[PDB]
Symmetry: C3
Subunit: 148 residues, 3 copies
């Protein structure tokens, strides 16, 4: 199997795929919140689900959308950086720590966001998760630059 192309790759693929699934869960929650609160973004949706007055914004829906957007701002770059980083021959344990800190940080972020936890809990989880991404980005920069 090509999952063995590098020792850090299986850990990366586990963490990344869990995070993609976590984003799908946010999307599912968002749809459920729209139905429950009867808050739809499109008139065609609203007319199917009770009438035109239900084409409206809702704070809980908007919160779900913010969580999903923040995921796109952070998890998508990780998918790129973590994949490349896996092939740079990092210490396997060090790489696992990068991926684990990101995974735990991001799951905590979603819990803090959707669960409306007091500030600055969410902000701290965001910052914690960005640390390994910054670290990987710099390592990739040096490796890329040195092969120019």
């Amino acid at each position: 199997s090509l999952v063995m192309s590098s020792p850090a790759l299986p850990a990366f693929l586990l963490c990344s795929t869990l995070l993609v699934i976590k984003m799908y869960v946010v999307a599912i929650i968002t749809g459920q919140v729209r139905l429950r609160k009867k808050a739809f973004a499109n008139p065609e949706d609203a007319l199917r689900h009770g009438g035109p007055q239900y084409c409206r914004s809702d704070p809980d829906v908007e919160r779900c959308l913010r969580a999903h957007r923040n995921d796109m701002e952070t998890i998508y770059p990780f998918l790129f950086l973590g994949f490349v980083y896996s092939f740079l021959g990092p210490n396997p344990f060090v790489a696992w720590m990068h991926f684990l800190v990101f995974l735990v940080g991001r799951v905590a972020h979603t819990v803090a966001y959707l669960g409306k936890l007091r500030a600055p809990i969410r902000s701290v989880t965001y910052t914690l998760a960005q640390l390994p991404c910054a670290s990987m980005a710099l390592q990739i920069l040096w490796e890329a630059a040195r092969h120019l």
Copy 2:
């Protein structure tokens, strides 16, 4: 050519690149709608195109933005999952079916969204397209986990 690294890879790259182009088409449509409806997000844009009163929201522009955002929520994860999945040695026909269902589902989604088709047509196309993504994610999870 490295497109032959795995039998499913060419089909994946065809479907993915078509979907990226499809997203670019949505971006082009969005700009055209902004010009036609004179609905700009930035005061500097509005002042070039008729005056400050044209820095305003428009329902058709917002609809285009929702379609593009939903594309980012779904197509970007597919780019990751489909790429990895291509290297896991899936049955070539089975893989083609995963990629084809996603491609057709997503093109239908954009048509349903921008064409304002009655509910739940768009919702069904979204769900249809998510099915192969869920399938690929689970397969990657097992492969990654088993190589830990």
Copy 3:
């Protein structure tokens, strides 16, 4: 090192990683603008930073969010297209030109957006940067199609 899998790869990884870092910079700027202008998206944030009246929208915050969103609409597809394109054996100089035009175009876009430069400066930078992406997408299409 696996950065040498193809002659264009180091240049791609340099430009891509710089762009990911550039997006992180936009995220940092966004947070700084929220604090400075006291404009928070969440009531829990606002209550930590002065009171509920600071859960409010701000034009500069919204501008930062638009820049970041446009980055997600354009840089993320480049991460995919540029990576694949690097392995298609393009002329090294031609590939460097694709990556450089995208990098310069996108950095200019962010400067034009956040710096509120007169129209159509931002629009032109967007269009300039999309050109190499369109070029790469078409090349990938042909390579993928021909290996079906």
